[PDB]
Ligand binder design. Structure first.
Ligand SMILES: Cc1ncc(COP(=O)(O)O)c(CN)c1O
Ligand SMILES: Cc1ncc(COP(=O)(O)O)c(CN)c1O
Ligand SMILES: Cc1ncc(COP(=O)(O)O)c(CN)c1O
Ligand SMILES: Cc1ncc(COP(=O)(O)O)c(CN)c1O
Ligand SMILES: [Zn+2]
Ligand SMILES: [Zn+2]
Ligand SMILES: [Zn+2]
Ligand SMILES: [Zn+2]
Lengths: 405, 405, 405, 405
């Protein structure tokens, strides 16, 4: 039977993910024989995460708290919101009310809920170029048109942002939202400077726009001085945040959040129960305890954080020993490094050869771009690989490198 | 600042509930701490659930499985889908391939993913009248127009279903989907007969329609014979199921699924990673073990199920005892009883008056209807309250009843 | 074949118009023998229009101007726009650039073009209650939600308008446009007072809303003072007008216009060629010469106008002496009088009986309301019927009335 | 003020048109002194049209028929529908009922009315490549996704059509309509062979698709045998036609039609009054007399048609004589000829340089393609320019051609 006839026309806005084509082409070789170390993942290190400790909490809460197995309010258990509030004020410089927090199915869920309430099909949403592949996909399947703005070692080029806004309006285009990942961007790995952050806020006010700040990697900072979220600088209330504990507490727990105000918060809350009903009860209680027991500092700060900072150094050391000639980013936050093949080279076919020949998995990155740029780009992860995997990983990458240029 | 201006016009399709307005007046009475018995809730008894056991497996999973903290595939871990296929084939008379099942954020998430792929704004979707408010709400905020078909003690009046289709088509109206809750429907509590289930499939085939079957309460059947889901008789492949373990495993785990095929499955999977990324890793693993070691039959079939059946009889005897001259449903499945005030009576204010004067919380019901009927309806839940609360619950309900009627 | 399955879901937003249903029930009576006296349709008197003259200029234009048979720019021939600009300056307080004028397929097309550029599905658009049925229908098939505001002898109640707006925003509803017919409204026949017009402009500014002014009957005024359009008072550029020459030159020529600015004008014009290509060349050239030769004064102002004014006096005169106990409107402009049956009486039912038992055609009216009110309303037209037919008509109308009430 | 913020998101789907942009850049040249030879716009020759004749009928109609200045039923006066039905049966092998004919504002309005009832945002609509730009623009601003299918001198490559269809379905894409211009296509000027017309009908039936047949040039055929419209072969009723008399009676009268059945016809009719109200009364009556008096035979068949055929031969003679090494279409019908510059050559700049240096106007070509093809295309029209102007225009064109290549 042809089910294609029953699809909604908006289903044609839904398309495949390149980061999924290779993550499957590898899943085929990883189970059907071959052994491979990947630099393509986006997960945090499960070994750096206190699993046994989380198992203990999971075990206690399930037998201790009956609610751990039942529905939770649409915006999350009050205690998690009260704790997340204090947590943000403590470690991310955020003075936010618990009533303004909405616990979602991870940042992904937060970005989706927001798009549903803020996007009308055709609306143009401007983003960094490149940007997080999944947010672009999320927004386009909602009918949005994406317009990207170039980035550099200091993040989005705020000067190019204003020009894009003007070029768009000069065409009579309707623009409303700006989507940005200020700290440790996926996939570039760069972070917006404080100078560009204040300039961004000025531009949002100037053109009367709203900003959606993605803080997924705010707690993965290693070098930064005292860089604060745009939200902490938001005196006009033009920014909305989409956060997550996935890179901390674990990426499978599905715990994230939205910080918004006024009628936007209201509509977000209103539409939620019929969409996901509520964020997972165990996850919320596990997170509530993790925070209350002060395990953030005890395990993530003075623990997993250093573990990531290290893998970052070794991957860069490895790159700066074997590929000192090539161009790549120097992240002071996040969990990715964007490597660049010679200008012109194909990044998707090269990513294939690394598997088809050297047995190492890397993400093309090309699909992370909002236009024709980024062909020769390649994203590399260092948060999942072991200390040993990384050197061999990029060494094999360096093997095929000169083996072609 | 007026955020109203930044909203997307489709955000106007988002509206309040009733199972929210009453739950806010109850929390307002509980905030300023006042005792109250609840018959409104839709949760399974957390005490009839083997929390302790789940906790141990939660501890096991997190301790020994690193993947229980990371991203699972968008459609779920292969082992869970393979187990579900077996669990369904054994307890729900359904034969399905693991490749055709997708683990979602409960039945809710399943219904939403399905709405997003099958609904274009303006599409009419046919449902039972009354039906589950959250699905009505979920589909309407996607822009669908709801057309209801009356139900009786044998479920949806299938004959009137064809009548509605004929009426709609006579007007030139486009319809493609029928959403039905065959067993232990929420809020009516009635279950479609096998006779009507066979006719429904024929009507869907005659008008080339697709059916969305909500199996949420298929495992909460008491004094029932041998009923099988529409999907088991679906020889043309016209039905899609939206199931869940919410009532079995726990309503907070967020574990549900979609069973679709062909291009509909493809599109559903393709859009999932950018929406929820994946169902909770823990939950997925907690459910995997739970099923693999036969705890469904050990704790639910011969433990929880019997507890619910018992609470069912107590509420009915209580109703039959105190309000013999009033009308209400006699469920053979599910967790609710629909009570009817005198024809003409306002159930919404009655519920408020019952909570303000007697301290018992019940759900209006009118909001579950698709047209102007059901004004005198009141939904009653018996799966969460205690055996002691029930009698006292409907007792007080009867006092205000005879007080006015 | 069942074409229902091919329809776009938005086609479901398209619905029937009683003002064209019973109007088609009369089209059957005429072409079937029955001698009918019509007080329905809103056509101008074809005998008060210089048909012969127009016939002469039509001949001329066709033989002397080769363009009268070919396409024209999407926004209309420059000469007509320039001629309309001056015309509007001399008779309607308007100082507009010919560049800001777009020649459309009557005001109908003007309203549809604006809806397409300003309305996202779900958007709330505020209108008067009652309001012009075709415009409500036009906006809703574009997915808008209509919210009406009661009118009186002085037009829209501006005080209730601000309450509705505060009401909407309190619910978190998004609103943006206000559609008003300030002079000689269809169907009430009332005109907004200069006092309320200034207040409306204040509210639009206060809430940052746009106003679309329908000027259809600005040239069928009979006794106001220097009442000026909202657009001539629009110092903030918040109003857009949708005008037409159909009530002057002839309702069948399809000559109307949109007056807008900036990006709205840009987009309105960008989308036009692909939907209508251009307004009728022959009609544009006929209108041009009609204007250039001073026929507006010679025939409309000093001919048609007076005839219509006479027809109005006659209808009100007849309504006053044979039906003095009924309440109805007294228009100072336009071509309609809204007549009212006793509260509770059914106007739709009354309309069918009148036609069936007396051969007089009137328009129900209820269809023009935005809510449940207006059941007893009946709209009467005095522009088309001869001055001999008018008294005979309402005389019969009075008879059915009195024997019923 | 920034009106961009008030735009509907869907306003962003509206974009510029080279065809409209070039026509306006030429009208400015005509007024700005310069006198040029035009081979662009798709207008009929105003001298080959019996203007003088149409003039007296226009005068006659206006003075004798009062209905010629008033509204008409949304679908057009009954007499016209009946005459068109007879006209189609005689000169276009079409047996259609007068009830299935809807008089629209030209072929453009017909196509817009159909898109609104048949397209949901995101729907894929397949067309020829290239195709008429206004239809592509019309469907895309309605949110449609266009997929073109290559054509040759025998029209659409039906074999490539089925491969495209299989390509779309394999990706899970939803498609339902196919828009085609079988005879004398704009811009290619080629006509589908009867062999492909039957194959197209088979494919539509095989995949259950609807076909919208554009018959704009069915009456400007010169050498085809007895080619019949797909609609005359539509035994399953899968084709809907969008026709017009613009190329016969005159392109500026705005007299076109839709031929559909069942629910599609019902909905196209229900929505029509609120978008255009009705086609121009004068144009309808003028067309009614034109047909009834047999002027199609007397002035078009034995007049205009032979005149156009001559211009058709003259342009081909001039081209083959001065550009014998360039490839260009040889139309057997229509009014356009697609000229091709050498592969790689930019057609839009060439058109500007031609208009600037030689003062001859042509259309860029590239805008009519659904993909990146056509860069070197240039559309040439032979219906409007005089017998004399054509050779001069093509010579000047040849001059710049070899001056560049
Ligand atoms: C920029 C960004 N935003 C949001 C997310 C979502 O994070 P999550 O759905 O695991 O809570 C990620 C991780 N893939 C990310 O990199
Ligand atoms: C009809 C119906 N369907 C599905 C569900 C599932 O809800 P979920 O798997 O998100 O706990 C429920 C529970 N409220 C329900 O009543
Ligand atoms: C208020 C109003 N607006 C617009 C119109 C449309 O006028 P037009 O004959 O130029 O399409 C009418 C009459 N049908 C009207 O009454
Ligand atoms: C293929 C095609 N279809 C439809 C039309 C519309 O013709 P019209 O709006 O003058 O009745 C044209 C000419 N603009 C055309 O080339
Ligand atoms: Zn994109
Ligand atoms: Zn509803
Ligand atoms: Zn309405
Ligand atoms: Zn295109």
């Amino acid at each position: 039977m042809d089910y294609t006839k029953y699809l909604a026309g908006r289903a044609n806005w839904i398309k495949g993910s390149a980061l999924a084509d290779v993550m499957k082409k590898a899943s085929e070789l990883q189970k059907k024989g071959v052994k491979l170390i990947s630099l393509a993942a986006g997960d945090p290190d499960p070994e750096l995460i206190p699993r046994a400790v989380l198992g203990e909490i999971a075990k206690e809460v399930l037998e201790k708290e009956p609610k751990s197995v039942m529905y939770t309010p649409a915006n999350g258990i009050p205690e998690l919101r009260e704790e997340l509030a204090a947590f943000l004020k403590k470690y991310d410089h955020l003075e936010v009310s618990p009533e303004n927090i909405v616990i979602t199915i991870g940042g992904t869920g937060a970005l989706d809920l927001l798009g549903r309430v803020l996007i009308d099909p055709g609306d143009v949403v401007i983003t960094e170029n490149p940007s997080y592949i999944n947010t672009l996909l999320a927004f386009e399947q909602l009918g949005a048109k994406i317009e990207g703005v170039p980035v550099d070692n200091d993040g989005m080029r705020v000067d190019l942002l204003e020009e894009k806004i003007k070029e768009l309006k000069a065409k009579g285009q309707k623009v409303k939202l700006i989507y940005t990942i200020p700290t440790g961007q996926n996939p570039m790995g760069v972070t917006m400077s404080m100078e560009r952050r204040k300039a961004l806020l000025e531009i949002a006010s100037k053109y009367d726009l709203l900003i959606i700040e993605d803080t997924a990697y705010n707690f993965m900072r290693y070098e930064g001085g005292d860089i604060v979220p745009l939200k902490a600088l938001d005196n006009e209330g033009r920014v909305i945040v989409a956060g997550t504990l996935s890179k901390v507490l674990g990426t499978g727990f599905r715990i994230g959040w939205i910080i918004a105000e006024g009628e936007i918060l209201k509509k977000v809350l209103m539409q939620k129960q019929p969409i996901d009903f509520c964020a997972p009860a165990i996850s919320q209680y596990i997170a509530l305890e993790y925070l209350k027991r002060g395990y953030f500092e005890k395990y993530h700060l003075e623990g997993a954080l250093l573990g990531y900072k290290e893998k970052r150094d070794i991957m860069l050391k490895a790159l700066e020993n074997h590929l000192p000639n090539a161009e790549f980013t120097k992240p002071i936050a996040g969990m990715f490094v964007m490597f660049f093949l010679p200008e012109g080279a194909d990044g998707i076919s090269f990513a294939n050869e690394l598997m088809e020949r050297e047995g190492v998995v890397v993400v093309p990155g090309k699909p992370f771009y909002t236009d024709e740029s980024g062909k020769n780009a390649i994203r590399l992860n260092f948060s999942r690989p072991s200390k040993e995997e990384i050197p061999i990983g990029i060494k094999k990458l360096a093997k095929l490198y000169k083996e072609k240029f």
